[PDB]
Paper text:
The crystal structures of the S and P domains of [name] were docked into the high-resolution cryoEM map to construct a pseudo-atomic model of the complete RHDV capsid.
The etiological agent of RHD is [name] (RHDV), which has a single-stranded, positive-sense, polyadenylated RNA genome of ∼7.5 kb.
Author numbering:
A (entry chain A), B (entry chain A): 67 to 229
Write the structure that this text describes.
């Protein structure tokens, strides 16, 4: 189905100008981060469970540099000097050919979350850990990173919404 | 589920001024006529099957008059002198206490219909057959008719839509 495949959600740019600690991508955990859960969330009041995010770095396994994708607990705001490796995180190397996937989990497995006004949910943040390096000639000094998502196996919608 | 219950879709007015042959309500057969199929139709390319429409006339079983609800084949346009009883139809009496339900069926059970640009689909039309009569004093000369829908048992969505 749609819930077993990853689907394109977004894209962001990573350039040699983005210094360590810069945040290049951020998103609150929500059904709006997948195009199918975004549709279905309009007919349910509640949801629960994780969402997987898969990043493909278009650096032809050649560029140097690294991002850290980290899951930030609710009501912690993240700055640019902010350490994130204390949070559940995965490292994304510019030279990797393969996709790197991170699970944004449900941090409150105790209570269904609203599909409406979200309350207190985790945030996914992607920050520069090592500077992007274009070895040798540019003039390509920026690359793109695609973001695709799929609901985790524990993702669910509940409570039909009164229309 | 949502597909077993009728849900409010719309409302229309019937007044003593509406003469026989007036059209008081009309709608193309479509998933947009139920609030749940309207949501789900955004993630599918195709659909098929019938939709039930239930009308409750708010005439306290007292007003005189009748409407005919008729299903009009595609590409027949209906005027106000237009006979409809040759089409599948049900009669709605102003004096009825109970709801009156009509099935708008899939007239092309041979081919899934698009949820997008609809092509050629039947139309539900409600026309005055006998004038609404307020016996005795008004000053209520108009009543409302609520419209509720539910997918028929053969209703289906197919072909996940490329987002």
């Amino acid at each position: 189905t749609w819930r077993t495949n990853f689907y394109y959600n977004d894209v962001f740019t990573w350039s040699v100008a983005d210094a360590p600690g810069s945040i290049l991508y951020t998103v609150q955990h929500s059904p709006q981060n997948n195009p199918f859960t975004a549709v279905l969330s309009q007919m349910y009041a509640g949801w629960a469970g994780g969402m997987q995010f898969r990043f493909i770095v278009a650096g032809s396994g050649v560029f140097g540099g690294r991002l850290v994708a980290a899951v930030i607990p609710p009501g912690i705001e993240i700055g640019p000097g902010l350490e994130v490796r204390q949070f559940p995180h995965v490292v994304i190397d510019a030279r990797s050919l393969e996709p790197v996937t991170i699970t944004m989990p449900d941090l409150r497995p105790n209570m269904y979350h609203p599909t409406g006004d979200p309350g207190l949910v985790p945030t996914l943040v992607l920050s520069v850990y090592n500077n992007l390096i274009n070895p040798f000639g540019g003039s390509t000094n920026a690359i793109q990173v695609t973001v695709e998502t799929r609901p985790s196996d524990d993702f669910e919608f509940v409570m039909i919404r009164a229309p």
